[PDB]
């Protein structure tokens, strides 16, 4: 059994397509509601689980918090695909550029388009894009504090070697 999100037990959380707009700790501009600064929000969960969840090859999705965790678990693999050989001062800028560049949302090019509900309206697509850009900017910034933990000029190999690993053999 792979590790599912803690937030699938949460209820009446806001939703877009069928992503969960889970509480977030961040500085980036966007629609995600502030988390408690003392608590693990979905990005501390997604970074904590990623290195275990990308070895499994069979993952049942319980609800919209797992659909969110999967998008995070896939975007960590894109970031570790980018980061090889960078200085932290370059990696911040390269992975923010990766986070902000134009991407396909579910319902548009998207790999898991079989499992994610398309946006409910022309307006739901914008609240989805402005969430997923805020999410993946924070996810990149948070990840970099782990991969450049002990030394600031060389990505720690214990994080970089998952760049070949690929959650359930899917990628963005």
């Amino acid at each position: 059994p792979a590790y599912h999100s803690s937030f699938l037990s949460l209820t009446d959380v806001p939703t877009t397509g069928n992503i969960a707009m889970l509480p977030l700790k961040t500085k980036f501009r966007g629609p995600a509601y502030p988390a408690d600064e003392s608590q693990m929000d979905i990005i501390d969960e997604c970074i904590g689980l990623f290195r275990a969840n990308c070895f499994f090859r069979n993952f049942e999705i319980k609800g919209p918090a797992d659909r969110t965790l999967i998008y995070g678990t896939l975007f960590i693999s894109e970031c570790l695909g980018r980061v090889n050989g960078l200085n932290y001062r370059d990696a911040e800028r390269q992975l923010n550029s990766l986070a902000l560049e134009n991407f396909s949302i579910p319902g548009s090019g998207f790999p898991l388009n079989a499992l994610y509900a398309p946006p409910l309206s022309p307006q739901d697509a914008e609240i989805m894009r402005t969430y997923l850009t805020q999410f993946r900017q924070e996810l990149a910034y948070r990840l970099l504090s782990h991969v450049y933990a002990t030394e600031k000029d060389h990505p720690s190999k214990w994080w970089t070697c998952f760049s070949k690993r690929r959650f359930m053999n899917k990628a963005l």
Binding site: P1, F55, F56, R57, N58
Partner: peptide
């Protein structure tokens, strides 16, 4: 030698790591 110090024997207790 890294996380294979534990993640390798875990093949018995989570064989999804090894096979579909």
């Amino acid at each position: 030698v890294g996380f294979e110090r534990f993640l390798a024997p875990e093949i018995f207790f989570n064989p999804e790591i090894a096979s579909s």
